[PDB]
DNA sequence: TTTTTTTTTTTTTTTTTTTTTTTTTTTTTTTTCCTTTTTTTTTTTTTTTT
């Protein structure tokens, strides 16, 4: 994202700090355990 | 002065509505997270005074 440490690195940079640069990111680290929010359906508000 | 005839008062059912309650295929394999918490009372400690 914007606010990580990883944002705008080019491919040599991200190897040189281990990372994948084919991994796409979207994911939260909580507790060393990489955690995903999936998007949940709602109906439209303010809709009659 | 007694009999019929109207009124009353229960009596049992009816019918519809509402409430309640109980249910939701079989087996198997992996992770993750939590298995307290702030509030109030009690006890000890530290500083101050005569």
Same mark, same amino acid.
């Given at each position: 994202?914007?606010?990580?440490?990883?944002?705008?690195?080019?491919?040599?940079?991200?190897?040189?700090?281990? +990372?994948?640069? $084919?991994?796409?990111?979207?994911?939260?680290?909580? &507790?060393?355990? +990489?955690?995903? $929010?999936?998007?949940?359906?709602?109906?439209?508000? &303010?809709?009659?």
């Amino acid at each position: 994202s914007t606010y990580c440490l990883l944002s705008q690195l080019t491919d040599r940079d991200l190897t040189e700090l281990n +990372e994948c640069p $084919l991994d796409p990111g979207g994911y939260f680290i909580i &507790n060393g355990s +990489e955690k995903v $929010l999936i998007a949940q359906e709602k109906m439209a508000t &303010n809709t009659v």
